[PDB]
Amino acid sequence: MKVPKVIKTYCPKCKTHTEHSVSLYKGGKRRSLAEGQRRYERKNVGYGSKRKPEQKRFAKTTKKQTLVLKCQKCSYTIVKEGMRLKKLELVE
Amino acid sequence: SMYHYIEQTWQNKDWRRSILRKRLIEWRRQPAITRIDRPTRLNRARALGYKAKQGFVMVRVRVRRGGLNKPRPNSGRRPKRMGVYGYGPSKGYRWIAEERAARKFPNLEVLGSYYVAEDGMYKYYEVIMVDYSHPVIRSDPELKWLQDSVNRKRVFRGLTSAGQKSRGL
RNA sequence: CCGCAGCCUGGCGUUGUCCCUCGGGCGUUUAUGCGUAGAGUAGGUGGGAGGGGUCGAACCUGUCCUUUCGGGGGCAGGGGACCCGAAAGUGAAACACCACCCAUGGACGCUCGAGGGACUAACCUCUCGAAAGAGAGGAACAACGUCAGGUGGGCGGUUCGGC
RNA sequence: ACCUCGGACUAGGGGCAAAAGACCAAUCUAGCCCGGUGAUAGCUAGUUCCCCCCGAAAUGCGUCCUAGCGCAGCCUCCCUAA
RNA sequence: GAGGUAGAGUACCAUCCCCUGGUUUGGGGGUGGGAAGUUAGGGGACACGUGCCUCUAAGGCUAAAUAUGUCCCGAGACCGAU
RNA sequence: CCCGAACGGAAACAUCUUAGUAGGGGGAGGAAAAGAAAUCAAUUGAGAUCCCCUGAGUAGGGGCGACCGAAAGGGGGACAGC
């Protein structure tokens, strides 16, 4: 697909339809020392089999594409619903 | 208070260590268990109540460093309990020191212990060892408790200071 | 699917002393600096118009080194006492004193590397020696412990869909 | 490479095997005995007094699920409700 | 009022391992470092700082209050010779 | 007091749990152990330890799965401290 860089949509803080910056969604860094991460080593310490099952088989060819819009007039950022696509082209 | 100054030289670091290294070598020639007529660092022994009155004695012993001397299993086991590296003898070497030391002189009893030197291949400790059958200590008001049986062979059940330490009180 | 022995490598400890070339430093020892306009070496920021002055200066005369030989910096004697301005320029001035930074070199006690070498006193191997102790070769390595990584059906538990 | 006798040694995930997965006490694809341990069975057989009333299903969906279970439908018993 | 004493490879720290709820927080050990010590230290749920509160280890030793039937008295909705 | 299991459970099973029990080794006594806080908790309080009832399947742990599982306080017993 093709999507323009700027889309006039509603801004919750601006309480009307405003211009926005549109870009793909990117996951953040794993951010070690998380509670869900801390227990991993505390569960991996000692002797035993691979404590947590890990996925090895993959079925879906692609992954869901998500749109991220930022509200220029108030620096707000909104999170949109995902969708399955080949590759979301950001060219206007 | 010499005992205050004995470790003033040897508190954490002193060139005294070079001298002991010489003593360290000769002790390896000495038997793994032996008797020394006068205990080394009285600051500990007297701190454990040792009295130079007739009826006490000092013993030195050495042990090998490393993890636990545990065999690999052979039957059908789950991976959890079958690894080997990383094990360690749960009860401390300070504790183990008296044990073999205790067996040496069963007609006596153990009170307290400490190391005095240590290299990368051996640990060297010193242990108070008391005769209770001596007709001297038999009449002490200050240690009349020992006349009872229950004080015997204690180190094997871990009622010594090390045992209490191993139990983490 | 994996796990654990064993193996290979490396780190740490048992680990000592002389070093040796170089590259790093640690706490020190010191000394070396021109885009233009200008009395002229303003390298860049500070307190600072006072700093030096028998609590030794201006002047010129040489021995000497260096540099964009521009020019400044260090030598005592000849000279027994004088110069910079708060005054003229510079997007940024005082060779007025004392500080900080960049930057060049050597050295001092300590540390790490590219490493290399040497020794023996550790330790190891062997022999003699009743013991005690002695001698011979390697060597701060090796080996051990511990940790990590690579390998690892040598051994251990397991699954091996459904219609 | 004969045969055999007396003594002795090698222990089970081991021992021995001029090696057949053979033998190791009649027990050998992992010996025996005793203990974990009254282990595990979505399997198989049995389950015992009388009378009387009421009185089914063999279907749907889900399930490493079709020799079982969960939610339904199908039963009985009780109470309330008008 | 003045002065003095008051327990080291111990605390504590990093790492590996063990276990317990102890979890970025507990205790033990191995390994490596490693203190202060009265004008000391520790503790008061992640870390650090600040105040406030309470204890003083690294040595002892200890009456009773509970664990049990090899045994001895007593009692029993325990069985009557498979 | 050290060493240290599988069986099963999770409808599979490997982390986990079954479990520091079965069992090994050492050493006692008639009881043993432990026993005088580096204890708690929290408005500035209590005052050794032990066991009994609660606190409480609470806190908290874990493919957050089966499951595991405190403490403080209160209420009882004897309450001795050198």
Q: How far is CA B101 from CA B54, B93, B98, B157, in A?
A: 20, 12, 5, 14
| Interatomic CA distance for residues B43 and B12, integer angstroms | 14
CB B55 within 8 A of CB B137: yes
| Interatomic CA distance for residues B165 and B41, integer angstroms | 21
CB B129 within 8 A of CB B109: yes
| Interatomic CA distance for residues B152 and B160, integer angstroms | 11
| Interatomic CA distance for residues A12 and A71, integer angstroms | 9
Pick among B80, B84, B85, B87 to test the A interface (most A CBs inside 10 A) = B80
Method used to solve the structure: cryo-EM
| H-run or E-run covering A40 | helix A35-44
Using the CB atom, is residue B114 less than 7 Å from strand E? yes
| H-run or E-run covering B108 | strand B108-118
Strand C contact residues in chain B (93-132), C-beta within 7 Å: 119-121
CA B27 centroid distance within chain: 16
Task: For residue B53, give the nearest of B117, B159, B142, B124 by alpha carbon.
Answer: B142
The tokens describing A10, both together, are 């509603």
CA dihedral B14, B20, B25, B31 (to 10 degrees): -140
Residue partners of A4: CB distance under 8 A and separation at least 6: A22, A92
Residue partners of B168: CB distance under 8 A and separation at least 6: none
| Interatomic CA distance for residues A51 and B20, integer angstroms | 49
| Interatomic CA distance for residues B112 and B49, integer angstroms | 9
Amino acid at B95: W
List the beta bridge partners of residue A68. Answer: A23, A79
Which residues of chain A lie closer than 8 angstroms to B79, CB-CB?
47-49
Residue partners of B94: CB distance under 8 A and separation at least 6: B113, B114, B115, B125, B162, B165
CB A70 within 8 A of CB A89: no
Instruction: Tell which strand D nucleotides have any atom below 7 Å from a protein Cβ.
Output: 13-14
CB B68 within 8 A of CB B87: yes
Q: Phi and psi (nearest 5°) for A11? A: -115, 120
| Interatomic CA distance for residues B128 and B149, integer angstroms | 19
> What SS3 class is residue B42?
helix
Asked whether residue A14 is marked as a ligand-binding residue, the answer is yes
Q: How far is CA B58 from CA B106, B125, B140, in A?
A: 14, 10, 20
> What SS3 class is residue A44?
helix
| Interatomic CA distance for residues B60 and B104, integer angstroms | 11
| H-run or E-run covering B32 | none
Residues in chain A: 92
Amino acid at B117: A
List the beta bridge partners of residue A9. Answer: A18
Per DSSP bridges, beta strands B56-64 and B33-36 are antiparallel
| Interatomic CA distance for residues A34 and B56, integer angstroms | 58
List the beta bridge partners of residue A71. Answer: A20, A76
| Interatomic CA distance for residues B115 and B98, integer angstroms | 11
Amino acid at B135: P
Tokens 């360690």 locate to B88
DSSP string for residues in chain B: -HHHHHHHHSSS--THHHHHHHHHHHHHHS-SEEEESS-S-HHHHGGGT--SSBTEEEEEEEEE-SS---PPP-SS--GGGT--TT---SS-HHHHHHHHHHHH-TTEEEEEEEEEEE-SSEEEEEEEEEESS-TTGGG-STTGGGGSGGGTTGGGGT-SHHHHHHTT-
CB B160 within 8 A of CB B98: yes
CB A21 within 8 A of CB A89: no
The tokens describing B128, both together, are 């108070």
The tokens describing A51, both together, are 């404590």
